[PDB]
Amino acid sequence: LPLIPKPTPFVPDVPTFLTLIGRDLKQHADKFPTWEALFTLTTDQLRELGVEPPRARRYLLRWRQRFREGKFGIGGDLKHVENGVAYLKIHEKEASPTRTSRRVVNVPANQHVEEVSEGERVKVKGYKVKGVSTIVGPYALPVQKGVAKLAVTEGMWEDKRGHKVDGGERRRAEVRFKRGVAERKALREKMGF
Amino acid sequence: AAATKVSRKMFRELHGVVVTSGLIDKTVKVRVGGQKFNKFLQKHFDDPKQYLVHDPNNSLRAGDVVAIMPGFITSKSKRHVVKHIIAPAGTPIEERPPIPSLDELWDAKDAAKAAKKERKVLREKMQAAEEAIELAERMARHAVREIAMREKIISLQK
Amino acid sequence: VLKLRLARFGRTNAPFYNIVVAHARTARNSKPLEVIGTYDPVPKKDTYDTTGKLHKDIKLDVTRAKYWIGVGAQPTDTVWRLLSLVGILDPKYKKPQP
Amino acid sequence: SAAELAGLPPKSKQESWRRKMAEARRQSLEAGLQGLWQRKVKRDQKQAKESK
Amino acid sequence: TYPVVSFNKTSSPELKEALETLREKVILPTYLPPELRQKIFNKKYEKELAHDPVTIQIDGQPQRFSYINMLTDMPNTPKNIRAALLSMKNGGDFANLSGLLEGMHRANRKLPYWLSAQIVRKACKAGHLQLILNMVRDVKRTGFTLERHETVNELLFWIQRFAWKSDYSEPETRKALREVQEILDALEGDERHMSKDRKRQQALTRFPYHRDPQFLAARLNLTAELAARRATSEQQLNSANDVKNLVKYAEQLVRLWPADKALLDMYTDEAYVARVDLRYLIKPQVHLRYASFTLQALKNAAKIVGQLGHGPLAAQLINRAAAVEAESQLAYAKVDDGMAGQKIYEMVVGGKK
RNA sequence: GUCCAAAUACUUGACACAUGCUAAUCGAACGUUUAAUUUUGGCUCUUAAUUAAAAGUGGUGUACAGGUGAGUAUAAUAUUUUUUCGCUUAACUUAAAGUGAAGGCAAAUCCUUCAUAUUGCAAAAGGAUAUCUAUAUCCGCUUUAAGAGGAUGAGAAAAGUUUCAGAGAUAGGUAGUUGUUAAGGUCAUGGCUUAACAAGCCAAUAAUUCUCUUAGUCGAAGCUGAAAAGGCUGAUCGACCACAUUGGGAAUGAAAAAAUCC
RNA sequence: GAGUGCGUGCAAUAAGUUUGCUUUUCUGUUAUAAGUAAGUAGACAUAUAGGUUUAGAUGUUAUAAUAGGAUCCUUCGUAUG
Ligand SMILES: [K+]
Ligand SMILES: [K+]
Ligand SMILES: [Mg+2]
Ligand SMILES: [Mg+2]
Ligand SMILES: [Mg+2]
Ligand SMILES: [Mg+2]
Ligand SMILES: [Mg+2]
Ligand SMILES: [Mg+2]
Ligand SMILES: [Mg+2]
Ligand SMILES: [Mg+2]
Ligand SMILES: [Mg+2]
Ligand SMILES: [Mg+2]
Ligand SMILES: [Mg+2]
Ligand SMILES: [Mg+2]
Ligand SMILES: [Mg+2]
Secondary structure (H helix, E strand, O other): OOOOOOOOEEOOOHHHHHHHHOOOOOOHHHHHOOOHHHHHHHHHHHHHHHHOHHHHHHHHHHHHHHOOOOOOOOOOOOOEEEEEEEEEEEEEEEEEEOOEEEEEEEHHHOOOOOOOOOOEEEEOOEEEEEOEEEOOOOEEEEEEEEEEEOOOOOOOOOOOOOOOOOOOOOHHHHHHHHHHHHHHHHHHHHHHH | OOOOOOOOOOOOOOOEEEEEEEEEOOEEEEEOOOEEEEOOOOEEEEEEEEEEEEEOOOOOOOOOOOEEEEOOOOOEEEEEEEEEEEEEOOOOOOOOOEEEEEEEHHHHHHHHHHHHHHHHHHHHHHHHHHHHHHHHHHHHHHHHHHHHHHHHHOOOOO | OOEEEEEEEEEEEEEEEEEEEOOOOOOOOOOOOEHHHEOOOOEEEEOOOOOOOOOOOOOEHHHHHHHHHHHOOOHHHHHHHHHHHOOOOOOOOOOOOO | OOHHOOOOOOOOHHHHHHHHHHHHHHHHHHHHHHHHHHHHHHHHHHHHHHHH | OOOOOOOHHHHHHHHHHHHHHHHHHHHHHHEEEEEHHHHHHHHHHHHHHHOOEEEEEEOOOOEEEEEEOOOOOOOOOHHOOOHHHHOOOOOHHHHHHHHHHHHHHHHOOOOOOHHHHHHHHHHHHHOOOOHHHHHHHHHHHHOOOOOOOHHHHHHHHHHHHHHHHHOHHHHHHHHHHHHHHHHHHHHHOOOOOOOOHHHHHHHHHOOHHHOOHHHHHHHHHHHHHHHOOOOOOOHHHHHHHHHHHHHHHHHHHHHHHHOOOOOOOOOOOOOOOOOOOOOOOHHHHHHHHHHHHHHHHHHHHHHHHHHHHHHHHHHHHHHHHHOOOOHHHHHHHHOOOOHHHHHHHHHHHOOOO
16 A cells, blocks of 8 residues: 655655755665665654654655655656756747747757657756747756756755744844844954954 | 605604793603613612604694604604694694694605705706816817817828 | 634543634634534444444534535635535545556 | 536636536535525424414 | 946047037936936926035046936937947947947937947948947847847848858858857847837738848858858868758748748738838848848859759749849849949849959 | 542732744745856956845735733613614625736836726736647736625614712703704715704703722623522633833724734 | 822923914826927938928926825924923
8 A cells, every 4th residue: 555656767766855855854864775665664663763853754754645646846757867967958849930839858968859759858847948048947057058957956846944034023123133233342342452 | 766755654652741842943842751660679660751842833832731753853852743732731722733744744754855856866967967068178179189180191191 | 704614622632623604813712603513533433333433423514504605615624524525515635546 | 607608618627626616605505595594484483383 | 237337438529529418418317316316307406406416426536417407408319329320430439339328228218210220230331240249139238129120131231241251251150150040049039129119010021030031041141151161070060060951941931931022022012111110122222232142142052952952942942032133133223323232232143343 | 648630720010031932924926136057258357148045125914813901980873672774995705807008116916107998087917837840728916796794884763771889079061062944965864064043952869070999891601509680709711891111193904903103 | 208100280392283364395187388308290301321300189398277195384292390
């Protein structure tokens, strides 16, 4: 019943998975000896290994069930990934004599877009072609004209926890007021010496 | 359809005695009987009340017994009307102006109210018609200028 | 915003809920407009039954609940599920088959 | 909706959901009013009978 | 964001007077806060501004703003821009257009639709094509939009002329071909060049500026002048790569460009009517201007494409050239002697030089 | 004085407070910057971009939840029952129609204004994702007709109800105040509003006003009695009122109903 | 003799604020005036050109009338005496 989904080219092993979802989960990478241990262990078994706090364990169990359903994050549907680095390219079509259709496709870094066939020319979801030679989409660093790459960055799939700007909406005017007093006391101090 | 008719409902009838009269036009102070219950002592106490009754034709004199009816709102503090005279004071009933029936009084309200609306529809139409004329004159001065400026251009193309 | 939600009552480690019709922005246990029913999360077992089965006793005024759903009442995720089992609304979540 | 009275299929995944929810509130309102009206007719009938 | 507009290179004394006028009254006020800008033009604060005139921290020494009569003191922008434009005769002078056109873009001065086509002609005939391509690139600042069908047809003309100026050498032809694509990319992708005027002209031609046979023939010209030189392999990779584009762009131009339709018949007959929309082509002096390279392209393209064994394209392209050559010849007789059109065509097509 | 569960736990100084937390959220509203990454141009500098973080502008929410009992002495445009009603541009349900043009700030779904919207007054805002070898969706915005809700209008009419702290003093109070005629306003009613007349109206045993002492109010909510329209309390529970160092104030908004703001 | 978070008279008074034989100012229409700055129209001509020229129909500027909203003054007004 606890089915294990086969690893994807973008998430080959566990250290990669725990790195994408962030939230300092790459510390427990050694707890899981295999890829099946992640999708097989239970809450109680994740608690004895030392997967704490409860927020990180519940967060992992969520992304665990989210992986089984194929609800990957960004760049989770790639196929031609090499050592954790993919490459994007533009595929120009002819939708009409006065128009062009550009789709961001994922192909090997060496091969040319036109050479690749339909079977191996994957269209990545979440990335679009702006203008004529721009690839717009999260974590799309440009390499050439009409070429970008997706490096596997820590927290690329994580749900960021909200943070307080300067002590929250209540304790804001007080925190900034005290910083100015400390700042002014250390500009005035150096003047003394 | 557009006229509002009064309720024309009949309420209870109270027997009272006029206390004052002639101080204000078409108004007399009638004293009726009442009774309030004291829940602490379990006893009924006399609770006489004095209202301002509407005497339309000034046919009441201080001392006469009259029968009044509530629900007839003629003023801020007047909610009662005179139904008839039980016992006159001073002079017989035949020597005083007649008391109009409740039907006649209600018909006056409907007639007066219906006439009030007839004045509005006229004032609203005249106000809207006398204003559309002014708004129709701006079109004139604005249309003659365009027709005077647009035909000039057209006169140099044919 | 009217809502069909639950009001937690009972003692420590003994939850007992009350289906109610209350405005969204109000206290959880404040006196609502109506009490549609009750809900007990802990499942019970028949007295003289040894099969081991378990049931959850729920009292619900389906007639009154339907009227409020027809005027724009928003049942919470928990009450939505209960109403679905009765057959008033469609399930909000379903087990993925693949 | 006009598109529903004309016999047209749902346009998108979201349209299908709105159709089901809108119909659920229609059948619930009908069964609710009628179901509650019989309670009133049944309640005031018992009162008038016992009081009479 | 950008540095304050300033003109510090003027070869002539008249140019500086025209820019200093616009700068101190039309461009600088655009840098003040909105409330202060209203004060400058108000009669009620005339006396107050005399005692304590507004100031501006501009690269050091500050400027001053007294009361400005909106009706009398303000100068005529179209006239001054003309005086400055004509006086420009040195590279240092034309470098002020980047600041000038930027100042008007800030002042929201709706300049004449034809002004851009004029700057591209006088600036390119002096050997300053880069200043134009640099502003056309920085349209977010200068406002040098390619909305007119003449500006694009005028800009692409000088681009090719510079390549042809030196017998279509490979070093420059690769540069020109790079520029023609940088423009066709802007017309398609960049949104700064799309305006109401462009939509009207694109409706009269039914060909967007990036799919116009008149413009696509410019790219096809240089690409045809690259395979001609070669058709060490590090260079052959380009030649073999250019032959793919040539056959590619050729079949794209033949599809759009209808059959036996000249330059004056390509677009709808209703386009040449309005003087603000594609009427420059009527005059024979301007027709031969944009019909010289466009004709030579088809001729050379039909030749090269014929050696590779493309019967259809060889006949198709010759059909267009035959239609344009016939129309072009009619212009040579109608055009007045000594006009620029009669000279360029004689030097490019005729080859008399 | 052995163990366990549940339920209660500053009743006094609304005394003063170290430290961490109780209201945040949306990048599918918006650009600013900084970093690397890739492109220009001129020969590190300089253009145009992508991306990620950090501060912000905006939208909604802080009007809910939670806390306290200092102040506060009541009959009031308070409250039930029946008849008759009205209003509601935010949000929640159902549907329909419309979603265009400029300027200001670095930019905007922020501000200012405009065109159109059954007659004539009167609106709006855009963003995002797919398909093909321009089209159609998604989330919104504006207007309109309804349902629900509502803290809604002084709603109105008829008949009723509300044990109003204790002590002392005060005989006048009311000026659109009371009534009539006329007119407007209102769904309707009412000096609600106005003009012109009349001198009334409430009260007389304190109506009204004043000083002092004390107090958050109520409920089989808690305790108690055999019981009384019982008595006491006004913790935990629910409803109502008031307050947020004290005092003096206004606006925004559908509505102050803020631990906001001046 | 000491204290006051009490009431009240006069003076004073921040935020705020009634009224107008106040003081500036912005906006809206309405009627004019101008066409030089802008902006919108038309006429003629020029050619490596894009100049000359008239015009107010929308709109800009200015005055006047008129409606309304913000300022100043006036009145009231915590602290305080
Ligand atoms: K209290
Ligand atoms: K005083
Ligand atoms: Mg007796
Ligand atoms: Mg306490
Ligand atoms: Mg609150
Ligand atoms: Mg739009
Ligand atoms: Mg009764
Ligand atoms: Mg009154
Ligand atoms: Mg107290
Ligand atoms: Mg309490
Ligand atoms: Mg004073
Ligand atoms: Mg003042
Ligand atoms: Mg002028
Ligand atoms: Mg004075
Ligand atoms: Mg004082």
